[PDB]
Nucleic acid binder design. Sequence first.
RNA 1: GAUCUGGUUGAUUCUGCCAGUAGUCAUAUGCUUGUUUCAAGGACUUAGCCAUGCAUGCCUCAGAAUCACUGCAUUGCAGGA
RNA 2: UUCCGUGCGAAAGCCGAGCCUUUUUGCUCGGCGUCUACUGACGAACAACUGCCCUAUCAGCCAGUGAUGGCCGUGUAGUG
RNA 3: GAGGGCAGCAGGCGCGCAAAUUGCCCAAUGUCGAAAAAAUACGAUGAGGCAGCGAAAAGAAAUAGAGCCGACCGUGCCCUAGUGCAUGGUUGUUUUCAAUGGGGGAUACUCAAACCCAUCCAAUAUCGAGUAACAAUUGGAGGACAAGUCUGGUGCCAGCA
Lengths: 186, 247, 131
Amino acid sequence: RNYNNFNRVWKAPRRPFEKERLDREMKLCGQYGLRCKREIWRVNMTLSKMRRTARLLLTLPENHPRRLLEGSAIMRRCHGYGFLDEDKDKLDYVLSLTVPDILERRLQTVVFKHGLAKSVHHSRVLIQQRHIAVAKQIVTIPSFIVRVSSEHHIAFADASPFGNGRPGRVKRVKRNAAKKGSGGGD
Amino acid sequence: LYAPKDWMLSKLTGVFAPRPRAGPHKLRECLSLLIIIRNRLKYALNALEAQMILRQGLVCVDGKPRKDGKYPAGFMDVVEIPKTGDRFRILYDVKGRFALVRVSEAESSIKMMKVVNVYTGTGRIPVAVTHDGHRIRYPDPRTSRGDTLVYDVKEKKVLDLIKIGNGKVVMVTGGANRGRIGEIVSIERHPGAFDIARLKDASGHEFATRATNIFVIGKDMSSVPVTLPKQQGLRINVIQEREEKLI
Amino acid sequence: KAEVTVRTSQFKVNKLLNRKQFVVEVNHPGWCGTVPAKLIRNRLASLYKVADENQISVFGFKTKFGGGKTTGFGLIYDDLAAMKRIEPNYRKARLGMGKKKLPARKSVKERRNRNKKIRGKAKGKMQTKKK
RNA sequence: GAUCUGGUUGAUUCUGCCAGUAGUCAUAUGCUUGUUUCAAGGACUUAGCCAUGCAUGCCUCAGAAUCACUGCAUUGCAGGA
RNA sequence: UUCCGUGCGAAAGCCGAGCCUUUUUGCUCGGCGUCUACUGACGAACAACUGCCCUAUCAGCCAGUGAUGGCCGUGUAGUG
RNA sequence: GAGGGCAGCAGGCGCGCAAAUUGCCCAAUGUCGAAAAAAUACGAUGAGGCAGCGAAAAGAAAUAGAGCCGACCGUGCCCUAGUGCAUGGUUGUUUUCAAUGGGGGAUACUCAAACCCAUCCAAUAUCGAGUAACAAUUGGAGGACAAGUCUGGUGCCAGCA
């Protein structure tokens, strides 16, 4: 009969009450002002996975393909994206890496870093009640990661009251003017 | 499923696709027409438009303009679609993949077919059978399987068969080296493993795949006046391709 | 009070079908007094400088969350005949130009459950489980 | 994550097994659910039993008046019982 | 030497057209139908080498015939 | 006399620890059939597809911002320290203007159909948050394994493990 390739992805992290484990993780989480450990898990996974890949890749008998392919790929996006660096180019940092490197490239945080917003939190919430363009949508999903030219893009929803030649019944909450016109209305 | 992967079908749907038909150019080495109507030329897009082709019959193929979409198209077939009058030939490009390859009407006025078998016919008659659906009476007196043969298509006319051997311009049609092209370097008899085939590609990089999957197509590049897939079948450095790509 | 406009982009010509397929980039905010349906279509007619303003098929939206948003895909018909043959009647209806067969969720699908064994007679409305 | 830890002594160093521990996105169930995106879903026990309801047909221009019927003033392609 | 499927080889059905004929009958031309044998696909049947899971207080098993093989024919779509 | 056979599909019951609808539709997909005079639109489809049912699962997520006062701790120094000032971080019934989606609606705009959002224009959309709201669970607090120093209960009981 017949199918679909859906699947199930990501993995949680082993064995709880390890004071340090809890501590370290938290601190990081503290920097970003978070909404779940799940977000960490997610990063660990990914982190790991490439880190895994890393583990594999280097040992590859030198002069053989993958290392070239994937190395370039990984290099160029991560590096591209504003993650990896030019000097993180012998794949040796790639073996290394840090979770923060990643967090740091949560686009939200980069923003706040970028300036914009008063914190990464302030940054979450903004983006989220629909604000600042880069893509098709503001960033509806501050969950995202960066990619180096979005970097530039980061600005208004001109769309938003926040960049409108007009505003809207919200945030600013024009509305009141509607209330005025209906209520106040002579 | 049993989807045939070099038909480049995909993702969701198509349990079967429209299944092909019994009738020359075998199940696995076909590239049947339907897929073309909808998925290649693209005008006709639904099944509804296909259906429409058919309820208003339309579509047309050299030889018989052909009625059957389920009828295999395969190496070298010549389509003309008179609404716009467009012709394509069936042929692999490198990296193994099949195109519908637009071809000159005049080039699209002949084809070449390998002999699969060479027989008597009833009465010092001989008849040859080609690896793609021809039986032809009274051929060369000494033709043989694995020699291809030029056909008029417009007419019923053999234009050739070419007294085969080693060192002849080949298009590798399968095994690993599908879409590889290489002049024959040679075949060693390997009897009952079949000859195995030393191939060298346009680089002059040489490669092997078994002798069975070998379509002589000429001498001096193409003897044939048929379309030659860009690159002409080495298979190389992907990487660079990626690189190349990114301007 | 405009404000509001329909940009198009990535457009392709299909000769054989006697019809044309293509992209739409749309904003609105201020204009109004505006708009219903017809114009959406007209613009694409007259974007491609085709007059028959009902020789137009439009589709190219559905939506979900992903807010406000307005990118379609559009089509342009050579003739009303070409349309009358390319467009199915619920679509045609979506324009307005005819209906397809009577539905009734296999109401008389039942005759079909009767018919292969049975010859002649019958004589219209002959009938089984439905008492 | 290429660790375990918890549990026999008067201590002590020990062989050593249980307890926990990590998954299984495997089944059931309990509890408890903001959106919302992406979702398999009466195999398993008895291939137990089954009302029910519903689940093979179709013609073109291209095999067949039949005076039914229908069509249209009528013809009448057609249609067609 | 021989035959209870071919002697498709046309006493049947479209659309299209010619010319006669008024047109029709006739006479033409054109594209399709009913239509047998051989091939191909297509597929199905049939078969080995190789490979498979528990278990000896399971070891011998195995030969009325079919067990193993050998003989003529059967018998089958054919092999046996 | 006659006559039945859902390990289709939905339905039923049944069993049992145990598993959703007598829903839409016939687009696409396939698939079959005849093969759109479509000159009369027009096969056929519990396959399939759409929904319905469906917290097994995978995607992403909500209680918002900020300031003022209170107040706080935490530094630098005045100063003894301190008030203070200064140097910082942070609480709150205060205080508050200020944040602001859910969430639902002009809806143009979907979908076979039905359906799951809505540009936020136009009375240039109305509307919608600071709260018990427009909402937090679940399970622990000797140890392993995070987390009581004990408020109160309790009394080898209840019960816990």
